[PDB]
């Protein structure tokens, strides 16, 4: 069995490559595909409120996603991997660290000592950064938006913090993919580099 | 403007206690009693999930508790002692280091992590610690329970460890614990909690 995250800022194509790599693993391997919370209703109660949240204070929200976090870790992740599955996770414990505690400022470590609190020692085997540059993942940002607009500078000076903030967790579980290429190739490198770990 | 909490293991008179003192105060200072979530909707649906929670995980309440605090702390208590008000808050922090720190055993230091990034700095100016010994607790506990039935082994085993758990959380060297002994009658408890205050009012 193996547990499988997927990290990277938005316009790294990450929706994209884990749907992708997902349907290609599924032929040979007893695997799933997630997302936190997963469906775990104690878990989406949870994110519901985030989401129905104006102006909600950041360490209030870091710690709910630990907490969502959690639940869809004892509730559904652990019990797949118990099972010898294969398990696809879209983001994780590197999410939180990239935006909560640096591009929002929290701070990363309290959020990593959050995160570790919620996470109990169970780590991902494998975790995928999508590494994408700022103009590019802006770029597929647009691209995919409604009417193809421009971004708020709000938006570019945050993705920039994410991107920075991914570029200080790298520094064995990671592996670094080109996401400044076409999908298709990022996809054909993420699938390889998940084989091959399979493999060993 | 002062922020007191009140931290005691059931059979100690908290809820007693707070609700005396407050009354004494309320004539002469500007006070409001309160107790988490308090009343802060963001707050009660978060901890709604914890009474509405099955066999949930222990540190998953663990995080559920720091957030409802959390709401509780910058959307009531802040804005309350910004405005000079004496805040008596039933349990905080020292709360959850002795019921899930040391109790359920997940570890007093990483829920004392866990509360250090939920009140980020924020600290009472005053913590009232009504120190009862489990024999008396017991029999307090026993006095107010519907049936007033011989507690079960596990609630002994536990109203135990949340004492044992607030015995080594006071060898604080801090000074914004006060100890009461709880075991005197209830009045005398009252008594030396309201001099406490007062006196710490008074500087
Ligand atoms: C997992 C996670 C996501 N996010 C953000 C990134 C996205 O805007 C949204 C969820 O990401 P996703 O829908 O692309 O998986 O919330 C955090 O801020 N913190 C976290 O811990
Ligand atoms: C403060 C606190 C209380 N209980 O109850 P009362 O009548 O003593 O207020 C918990 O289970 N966890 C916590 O964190």
């Given at each position: 069995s193996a547990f499988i995250t997927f990290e990277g800022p938005e316009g790294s194509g990450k929706t994209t490559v884990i749907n992708e790599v997902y349907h290609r693993l599924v032929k040979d391997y007893d695997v799933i595909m997630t997302r936190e919370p997963?469906?775990?209703?104690?878990?989406?109660?949870?994110?519901?409120?985030?989401?129905?949240?104006?102006?909600?204070?950041?360490?209030?929200?870091?710690?709910?996603?630990?907490?969502?976090?959690?639940?869809?870790?004892?509730?559904?992740?652990?019990?797949a991997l118990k099972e010898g599955k294969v398990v696809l996770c879209d983001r994780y414990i590197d999410s939180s660290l990239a935006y909560q505690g640096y591009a929002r400022g929290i701070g990363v470590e309290e959020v990593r000592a959050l995160n570790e609190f919620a996470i109990n020692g169970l780590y991902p085997d494998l975790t995928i950064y999508l590494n994408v540059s700022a103009e590019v993942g802006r770029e597929r940002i647009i691209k995919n938006s409604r009417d193809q607009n421009r971004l708020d500078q709000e938006d570019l000076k945050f993705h920039e913090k994410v991107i920075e903030g991914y570029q200080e967790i790298i520094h064995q579980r990671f592996k670094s993919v080109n996401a400044d290429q076409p999908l298709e190739n990022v996809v054909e490198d993420t699938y390889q580099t998940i084989i091959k770990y399979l493999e060993k």
């Open positions: 997963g469906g775990v209703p104690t878990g989406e109660e949870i994110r519901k409120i985030v989401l129905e949240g104006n102006d909600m204070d950041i360490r209030t929200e870091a710690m709910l996603f630990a907490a969502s976090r959690r639940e869809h870790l004892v509730l559904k992740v652990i019990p």
